[PDB]
Design a protein around this ligand. Structure first.
Ligand SMILES: *[C@@H]1O[C@H](CO)[C@@H](O[C@@H]2O[C@H](CO)[C@@H](O)[C@H](O)[C@@H]2O)[C@H](O)[C@H]1NC(C)=O
Ligand SMILES: *[C@@H]1O[C@H](CO)[C@@H](O[C@@H]2O[C@H](CO)[C@@H](O)[C@H](O)[C@@H]2O)[C@H](O)[C@H]1NC(C)=O
Ligand SMILES: *[C@@H]1O[C@H](CO)[C@@H](O[C@@H]2O[C@H](CO)[C@@H](O)[C@H](O)[C@@H]2O)[C@H](O)[C@H]1NC(C)=O
Ligand SMILES: *[C@@H]1O[C@H](CO)[C@@H](O[C@@H]2O[C@H](CO)[C@@H](O)[C@H](O)[C@@H]2O)[C@H](O)[C@H]1NC(C)=O
Ligand SMILES: *[C@@H]1O[C@H](CO)[C@@H](O[C@@H]2O[C@H](CO)[C@@H](O)[C@H](O)[C@@H]2O)[C@H](O)[C@H]1NC(C)=O
Ligand SMILES: *[C@@H]1O[C@H](CO)[C@@H](O[C@@H]2O[C@H](CO)[C@@H](O)[C@H](O)[C@@H]2O)[C@H](O)[C@H]1NC(C)=O
Ligand SMILES: *[C@@H]1O[C@H](CO)[C@@H](O)[C@H](O)[C@H]1NC(C)=O
Ligand SMILES: *[C@@H]1O[C@H](CO)[C@@H](O)[C@H](O)[C@H]1NC(C)=O
Ligand SMILES: *[C@@H]1O[C@H](CO)[C@@H](O)[C@H](O)[C@H]1NC(C)=O
Ligand SMILES: *[C@@H]1O[C@H](CO)[C@@H](O)[C@H](O)[C@H]1NC(C)=O
Ligand SMILES: *[C@@H]1O[C@H](CO)[C@@H](O)[C@H](O)[C@H]1NC(C)=O
Ligand SMILES: *[C@@H]1O[C@H](CO)[C@@H](O)[C@H](O)[C@H]1NC(C)=O
Ligand SMILES: *[C@@H]1O[C@H](CO)[C@@H](O)[C@H](O)[C@H]1NC(C)=O
Ligand SMILES: *[C@@H]1O[C@H](CO)[C@@H](O)[C@H](O)[C@H]1NC(C)=O
Ligand SMILES: *[C@@H]1O[C@H](CO)[C@@H](O)[C@H](O)[C@H]1NC(C)=O
Ligand SMILES: *[C@@H]1O[C@H](CO)[C@@H](O)[C@H](O)[C@H]1NC(C)=O
Ligand SMILES: *[C@@H]1O[C@H](CO)[C@@H](O)[C@H](O)[C@H]1NC(C)=O
Lengths: 177, 621, 338, 48, 48
């Protein structure tokens, strides 16, 4: 690009103009090329800052997803994250987020707590769920109904303050023995 | 390589006039001519060029023959049918190998399609050719590049153009070139395989600005569109009194340089033809303005400083000049906007026995700052004497421009006047002799209001222009409103149409159909502009009424709006996405579908628990 | 958190050489200094679109609130969309829109009334007069509101399950119990003071609306983004009145005043000034776009964690033990209710 | 981890034109090439 | 001289570098060479 000079070839305008004549044109070419190089350097700096942001993100992703299980949702892939496997790529990394995703689900019923005898029973972990006629306890992300026993649930309440409690019988493994 | 060039080319799918033969029309020539023909053996010898083809202007002739050519530059008279009858002031003959080549495979079936292109760019008559043995019966559509044959710096004026015939006992394909931008695909062997115009189709323009021949699916910002003005209005003030240039020029006692007579010129129309008439010009060197463009300018005030000075002193009078005149007598300011006029006057500043009426200052206590008169007779001090008189060490400051009818050119009484203008923002009382056209409103036009040039749309206003107000602006200091000089009314000024064109296309491997989006413009405006053919874009994309969609992001031409909702394929802007969908295939724009409409079954005591699970591996890059 | 900035499509040809063939020809002597700037602005605009896409388009399926709205006592009418309003936005979402003023909408197609401006033509008309336009966002503030409605309805009817796979309905009292259990307090606490916690939730939600109503500007970040963009654009257009050492700052003037071989010098000075100013604008826009991209990535992460689930990371999703987070769309940004 | 950098507030007027009225007038012809830099550095310091 | 760093003045085209035989397909009117970035690549030998 001539940048408003006589020509865009250094070896030409040097051999075609004595220093004084060339000087002015050489100055024009320098002030054009130097400005273009500054533009390139600034764009490279900004792109390198962006790539450093992406690389810090990738390093965090590796340190969390790869070297461990990440409890933060939608960070290591969509769904409940299980594990990850890095794969080297040209000028980058590729992750293989292995994720646990739920499937077919059924309306059953639910209640915040179960009142056996004047006392409220809450699940130690999991949901209170009902087939429709026999109440059950089960985990949250998988339907594994279990008989509601005094070890599956902890009792704290008075059967009169919980909104939505349901009458049912809980089981204890000690009375039989 | 996909090198992009900007030169004279035949526009793709342009108009080419096909002739016949069995008288020989004189085709006009301008910006180059594409020539093609298809003959059995030989019926076209050569071509004739030049202006008026007579013995008054140089002309050309490129007649071929069996073995050579006969390129020449001459002033032939006529032949009305050897090929001429006059070679008087005629040179630059030329002979080389014949342009025509013919080969036959033992049969006259083959009719080589001979194509030629000529041009006259800065002289240097260029000729390009390529012979395709392919019979050109039906103007072929495959690509065939053109190789230059000869290139001779003719250096004449060519406007008309003719052709020659042969004797015996379907051809003449002619097109006209235009300055266009082309993108050319070079083969690995250095030939040209395919080229695409860059002002023909929206797809072609996108392909040009995205230099390639395969354009992937997406939306590409290529250029902008502007409503070119239709009329050009110039509204100069309501005054017709010619300026007093005649009086100052018709004067005779032009004062000396020490007392530069300065006249003020205002409230007049300056037609510098009268400046030319009373002026055997010698030096019309103008600084702030071009002397050619002086009849189209408006100046707030015009000063005329007239003073007769000597031959070298006129080259010594200039903005920030130095010397015995430009330091103690008359100094022009560095940022001078105007110029000087000088013409020899040896009949009014001369007589027998001599004349010494004029004067000039040589001795001043200091330099003369720009535009100051220093009329004073104080003897210059030398050494330390307060001497008041003449003699040695006591010098009378100003010496005489004695003028007689016998001096050398360096000493003749040159009559010099300077014109100083003030080309700034203020009601201009002095303007050129340009006529004041009518006023047209609500239509993009070029305005020259009181010398304020520009382009846009004008109309009535409800401003409160104070009587002294003359212009308008905004916090960004851009001329907004101009008071009409001959109507004393307020006219707002609008951008021409400025916007932005983005072509929306699927991959060229899929289809050649595209969608054009003019950014931020009501599509009625671009439709009337298209119908008036005042739009800068030349790719006139079709409008069948079904392909127009005033988007919130501009308006879309070439895609039909569907009321359905699909996933966003090509983003447009403002909730609109375009995609290539079957009907049998066309481009459709639609409001993007954010996702499948779903309603959850929330209730007081209803819960959903997954009885099964899946493992899915997603990828992140 | 800011999510996006105003998209601009600077055209150097019109900006530096208003319809001047000679100026354009001299500009072609500067090489592809222009296509670089146009490409950079195109990339910034696409990047803004991608930022909004990442921040909001997190849920493939658009969910809706149930026809009845009784979430165990929790009053969500302040953040749920209002069917009565034509724009279908939340009451707390309307305040943000009314508390932010955009200098240039971009989606105005204002041409036709610059002549009809009657009074002094405004910033938008001036910018159009010199090749300086604003593109509109791909996602309108109406469908972004529907994204936010989907995100909000998914977190009140399905908890965090919709952020993983199929949206599994769960009563809000039980979702509250599960969030409580997620920070080390047993469910019985919630099921024993459900009425009290519902009252506290309603009071806090109600009093945040007044806290945003009466405050001068708590949205100072979004208004900061808007002011920075408008101010950079205004500084850009103001450079068209700088002589840069030329005879005059008007190309049509110095072209109509000086013949080409002399006017080429002044036009070259004007080119070398305006190109430098335009490159300054482009570089500052690139830096601001990088900052906004960082902020939008942070906002996307905040949405994905705080909204689509409970975050164990302290002080990330608000101060205190995080329970949920309701996003609310704002002009060129997002507002979270932790 | 770095948390902040030095807060610089260079003034273009003196930096380019040390107490020179002629240089100040020539700088004024460059438009708001100065307020931009001053605002940028002020924003940088506030952000620090 | 080929395969050696030399300063060339080919038909007024000045520059420095290394030259060698090619298998180009220069057209008979072809005289110079270049590349995608428009830099002189090949020169047709005036005397060969
Ligand atoms: C309630 O949950 C019960 C699971 O124990 C289901 O009852 C089963 O019924 C079969 C006979 O139909 C028994 O053989 C078995 O032991 C078990 O009791 C029952 O289907 C379920 N209720 C509903 C409505 O699904
Ligand atoms: C669960 O079972 C309780 C006794 O086993 C029920 O309490 C009864 O309440 C009635 C009034 O509804 C009294 O009249 C009676 O004396 C006894 O206290 C309780 O109502 C029941 N709840 C449900 C939801 O079935
Ligand atoms: C470029 O030129 C080469 C030299 O002629 C071509 O190679 C030739 O290919 C032909 C067959 O087409 C062979 O018969 C010959 O021996 C030689 O290999 C080459 O094809 C050509 N490339 C093009 C035109 O794209
Ligand atoms: C410069 O010379 C001009 C021509 O002689 C003067 O203009 C004229 O002056 C006469 C008086 O001599 C007027 O009657 C006439 O109307 C016209 O103005 C002009 O005044 C003079 N200026 C100076 C400053 O000397
Ligand atoms: C949970 O989902 C699995 C796949 O998503 C089911 O496995 C399937 O098993 C059948 C045979 O029964 C195969 O034909 C099929 O390809 C798949 O492997 C699995 O049965 C299912 N389990 C329940 C309890 O629904
Ligand atoms: C949820 O919170 C809403 C807050 O806007 C309540 O609306 C109120 O309606 C009353 C009129 O009855 C207004 O006076 C008040 O200003 C407010 O708009 C709404 O009733 C409430 N609903 C429930 C079920 O809690
Ligand atoms: C739960 O019941 C509702 C009531 O019709 C239904 O719409 C929903 O699909 C059911 N969910 C299931 C079966 O998972
Ligand atoms: C070529 O000329 C014919 C004859 O009028 C016309 O119909 C046709 O439109 C012209 N070509 C183009 C591209 O306009
Ligand atoms: C053809 O033109 C050449 C050019 O001088 C001439 O010598 C020759 O006599 C002409 N005729 C033939 C048959 O070659
Ligand atoms: C050639 O041009 C000169 C120009 O003065 C003219 O006098 C002369 O007659 C011309 N020769 C002719 C006509 O043969
Ligand atoms: C060339 O001829 C045209 C047609 O008469 C004329 O208008 C033009 O001025 C001529 N140019 C020159 C340089 O003689
Ligand atoms: C003065 O006016 C007369 C009018 O006939 C004209 O002939 C003469 O050339 C003029 N002189 C000058 C110097 O303009
Ligand atoms: C302009 O001049 C003409 C002729 O003297 C007159 O009729 C008209 O009213 C004038 N207009 C203005 C605005 O002065
Ligand atoms: C732009 O939109 C339509 C289409 O042209 C029409 O009402 C008018 O031209 C403009 N309307 C407004 C409100 O600017
Ligand atoms: C179909 O599209 C038209 C506009 O082309 C619109 O007026 C109409 O309401 C649409 N119909 C449906 C059912 O959306
Ligand atoms: C939930 O309970 C409330 C109050 O008891 C009642 O108004 C509402 O209709 C119930 N909804 C369902 C789905 O049971
Ligand atoms: C150059 O000229 C010499 C002497 O006339 C001759 O021997 C040689 O073949 C020529 N070569 C070329 C390439 O023209």
């Amino acid at each position: 690009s001539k940048f408003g000079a006589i020509s865009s070839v250094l070896n030409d305008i040097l051999s075609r103009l004595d220093p004084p004549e060339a000087e002015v044109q050489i100055d024009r070419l320098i002030t054009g090329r130097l400005q273009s190089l500054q533009t390139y350097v600034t764009q490279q700096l900004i792109r390198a800052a962006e790539i450093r942001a992406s690389a810090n993100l990738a390093a965090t992703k590796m340190s969390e997803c790869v070297l461990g299980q990440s409890k933060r949702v939608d960070f290591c892939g969509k769904g409940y994250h299980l594990m990850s496997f890095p794969q080297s790529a040209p000028h980058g990394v590729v992750f293989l987020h292995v994720t646990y995703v739920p499937a077919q689900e059924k309306n059953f019923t639910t209640a915040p707590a179960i009142c056996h005898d004047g006392k409220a029973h809450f699940p130690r972990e999991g949901v209170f769920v009902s087939n429709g006629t026999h109440w059950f306890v089960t985990q949250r992300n998988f339907y594994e109904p279990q008989i509601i026993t005094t070890d599956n649930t902890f009792v704290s309440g008075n059967c009169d303050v919980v909104i939505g409690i349901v009458n049912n019988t809980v089981y204890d493994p000690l009375q039989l023995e | 390589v996909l090198h992009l060039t900007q030169d004279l080319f035949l526009p793709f799918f342009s108009n080419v006039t096909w002739f016949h033969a069995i008288d020989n029309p004189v085709l006009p020539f301008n910006d180059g001519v594409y020539f093609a023909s298809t003959e059995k053996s030989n019926i076209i010898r050569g071509w004739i060029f030049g202006t008026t083809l007579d013995s008054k202007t140089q002309s050309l002739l490129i007649v071929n023959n069996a073995t050579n050519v006969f390129i020449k530059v001459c002033e032939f008279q006529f032949c009305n049918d050897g090929v001429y009858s006059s070679a008087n002031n005629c040179t630059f003959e030329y002979v080389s190998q014949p342009f025509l080549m013919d080969l036959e495979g033992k049969q006259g079936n083959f009719k080589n399609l001979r194509e030629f292109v000529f041009k006259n760019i800065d002289g240097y008559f260029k000729i390009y050719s390529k012979h395709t043995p392919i019979i050109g019966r039906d103007f072929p559509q495959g690509f065939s590049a053109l190789e230059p044959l000869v290139d001779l710096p003719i250096g004449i004026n060519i406007t008309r153009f003719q052709t020659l015939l042969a004797l015996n006992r379907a051809d003449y394909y002619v097109g006209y070139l235009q300055p266009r931008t082309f993108l050319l695909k070079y083969n690995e062997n250095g030939t040209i395989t395919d080229a695409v115009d860059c002002a023909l189709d929206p797809l072609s323009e996108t392909k040009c600005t995205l230099k390639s021949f395969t354009v992937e699916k997406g939306i590409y910002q290529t250029s902008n569109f502007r409503v070119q003005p239709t009329e050009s209005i110039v509204r100069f003030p309501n005054v017709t009194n010619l300026c007093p240039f005649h009086e100052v020029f018709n004067a005779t006692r032009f004062a000396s340089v020490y007392a530069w007579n300065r006249t003020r010129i205002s409230n007049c129309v300056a037609d510098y033809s009268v400046l030319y008439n009373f002026a055997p010009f010698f030096a019309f060197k103008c600084y702030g303005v071009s002397p050619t463009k002086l009849n189209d300018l408006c100046f707030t005030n015009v000063y005329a400083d007239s003073f007769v000075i000597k031959g070298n002193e006129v080259s010594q009078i200039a903005p920030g000049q130095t010397g015995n005149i430009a330091d103690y007598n008359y100094k022009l300011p560095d940022d001078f906007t105007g110029c000087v006029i000088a013409w020899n006057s040896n009949k009014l500043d001369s007589k027998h026995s001599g004349n010494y009426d004029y004067w000039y200052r040589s001795f001043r206590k200091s330099k003369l700052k720009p535009f100051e008169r220093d009329i004073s007779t104080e003897i210059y001090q030398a050494g330390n004497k307060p001497c008041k008189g003449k003699g040695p060490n006591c010098y009378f400051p100003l010496q005489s421009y004695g003028f007689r009818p016998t001096y050398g050119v360096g000493h003749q009484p040159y009559r010099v006047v300077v014109l100083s203008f003030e080309l700034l923002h203020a009601p201009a009382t002095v303007c050129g002799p340009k006529k004041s056209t009518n006023l047209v409103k609500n239509k993009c036009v070029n305005f020259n209001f009181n010398g304020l040039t520009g382009t846009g749309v004008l109309t009535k206003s409800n401003k409160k222009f104070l009587p002294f107000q003359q212009f308008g602006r905004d916090i960004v200091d851009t001329t907004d409103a101009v008071r009409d000089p001959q109507t004393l009314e307020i006219l707002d000024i609008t951008p021409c149409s400025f916007g932005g064109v983005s072509v929306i296309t699927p991959g060229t491997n899929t289809s050649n159909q595209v969608a054009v989006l003019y950014q931020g413009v009501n599509c009625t405006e671009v439709s009337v502009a298209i119908h008036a053919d005042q739009l800068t874009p030349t790719w006139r994309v079709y409008s069948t009424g079904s392909n127009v969609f005033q988007t919130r992001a501009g308006c879309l031409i070439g895609a039909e709006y569907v009321n359905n909702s699909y996933e966003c394929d090509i983003p447009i802007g403002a909730g609109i996405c375009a995609s290539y969908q079957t009907q049998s295939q066309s481009i459709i724009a639609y409001t993007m579908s954010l996702g499948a409409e779903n309603s959850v079954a929330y209730s007081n005591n209803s819960i959903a628990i997954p009885t099964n699970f899946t493992i899915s591996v997603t990828t992140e890059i | 958190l800011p999510v996006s900035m105003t998209k601009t499509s600077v055209d150097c040809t019109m900006y530096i050489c208003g319809d001047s063939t000679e100026c354009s020809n001299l500009l072609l002597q500067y090489g592809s200094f222009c296509t670089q700037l146009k490409r950079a602005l195109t990339g910034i605009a696409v990047e803004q679109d991608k930022n909004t896409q990442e921040v909001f388009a997190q849920v493939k399926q658009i969910y809706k609130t149930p026809p009845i709205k009784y979430f165990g006592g929790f009053n969500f009418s302040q953040i749920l969309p209002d069917p009565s309003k034509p724009s279908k936005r939340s009451p707390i979402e309307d305040l943000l829109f009314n508390k932010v003023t955009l200098a240039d909408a971009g989606f105005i197609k204002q041409y036709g009334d610059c002549l009809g401006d009657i009074a002094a033509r405004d910033l938008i008309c001036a910018q159009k007069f010199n090749g300086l336009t604003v593109l509109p966002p791909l996602l309108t503030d109406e469908m972004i509101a529907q994204y936010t409605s989907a995100l909000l309805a998914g977190t009140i009817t399905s908890g965090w399950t919709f952020g993983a796979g199929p949206a599994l309905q769960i009563p809000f009292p039980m979702q509250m119990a599960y969030r409580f259990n997620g920070i080390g307090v047993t469910q019985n606490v919630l099921y024993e003071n459900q009425k009290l916690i519902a009252n506290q939730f309603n009071s806090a939600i109600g009093k945040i609306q007044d806290s945003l109503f009466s405050t001068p500007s708590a949205l100072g970040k979004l208004q900061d983004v808007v002011n920075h963009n408008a101010q950079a654009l205004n500084t850009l257009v103001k450079q068209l009145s700088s002589k840069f050492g030329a005879i005059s700052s008007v190309l049509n003037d110095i072209l109509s005043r000086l013949d080409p071989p002399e006017a080429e010098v002044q036009i070259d000075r004007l080119i070398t000034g305006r190109l430098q100013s335009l490159q300054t604008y482009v570089t500052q826009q690139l830096i601001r776009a990088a900052e906004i991209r960082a902020s939008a990535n942070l906002a996307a992460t905040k949405m994905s964690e705080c909204v689509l689930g409970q975050s164990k990371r302290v002080d990330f999703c608000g101060k205190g033990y995080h329970l949920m987070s309701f996003p609310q769309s704002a002009p060129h940004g997002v507002v979270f209710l932790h």
